[model samples]
Target: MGPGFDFAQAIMKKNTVIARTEKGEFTMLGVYDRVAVIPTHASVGEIIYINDVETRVLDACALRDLTDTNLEITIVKLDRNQKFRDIRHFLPRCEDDYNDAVLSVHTSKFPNMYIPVGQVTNYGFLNLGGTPTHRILMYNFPTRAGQCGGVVTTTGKVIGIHVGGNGAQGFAAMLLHSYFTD
Candidate 1:
């Protein structure tokens, strides 16, 4: 606990939305400016519901290359009618340093729950499948399936997007500064 280090503020409920599609329900991080980010597993052209509000998957891209991190993410268009338009969004961290404590907010099995604070265990490349790879980070906290696309924060700034986890180990896709812009 220190000055200007409010963990509660970092866990803004509005920053997360429950995405329901034909596949299933998943989490999504609100990025403001009329857009939100979701996991690539979500099908394109599907009408997904964001917190009960209907929206469509506008585009999606997978992170593939020499690293083969296997990071896939999608962008969904949000209309002004969505309440996320009026809420504060997560600020993407600029530095690559991974020293600060990290936490993830999501509505997995229960609503408004956050993974306990933990430190990043590793930062490197991972290839879940295919040839091209992508960079991802492993943390010391456990997360649930529905938590995919949840915002991973450090010192109140978003550093990654929670992809999945098992037991006490969690994995996330490094959030690039360009994510919010592009």
Candidate 2:
């Protein structure tokens, strides 16, 4: 491979994420991820790169008889560090307020065109500012506010890479251990 690339780090590491849709409402649980690279000057909410991701079958009810779903869902593994600023009020301090934050992010009265996906599926932002840090989730849920391709962090490791933003989310470009699968 190449110098400075940590294969051990990639194979041994992964992050946990719980993503729910703004329109769908129920959260998809147990998503594992790893850190991907973002350009040095990449902004928060910007889709820096496409990292690794996995897929599990959606529940029967969630599928709604939509067989052969073959959900080619694209994920944006974020760096976590690339987050917005002064975004405390937007994130949900507790689960009870998570949806509230989602609503505020998608406040546009006309979501059909601006954020078309929000019309079909329920997706949201993530902000990890609990007293000391408010990185990754800060913007995904559109907290604090951010652009696309933002970076996200977890436990000092790069977990999520920014993908989706504004109305649409960005796509992941690479994964840590796997050769550029995209």
Highest lDDT: give the candidate number.
1
- In candidate 2, what are the lDDT values of residues 1-182, reduced to their tens digit? 22112321222232222222222111111123332232212321332212222223222111001343211123334444332222122222221111111111111221111111111122222221221111222223332233222223222222233333333333211112221133
Q: How far in Å is the alpha carbon of 23 misplaced in model 2?
A: 29
Stretch of 10 with least lDDT, candidate 1:
2-11
TM-score of each model, in listed order: 0.75, 0.20
Q: What are the C-alpha RMSDs, in order, of all predicted structures?
A: 3.7, 17.5
State how far residue 26 of model 2 sits from its true place (Å): 32
C-alpha lDDT of all candidate models, in order: 0.60, 0.24
Question: Once superposed on the true structure, which residue ranges of model 2 sit more than 4 Å away at CA?
Answer: 1-140, 143-146, 166-174, 180-182
Alpha-carbon deviation at 166 in model 2, angstroms:
5.3
Error of 2 at 159 (Å): 2.0
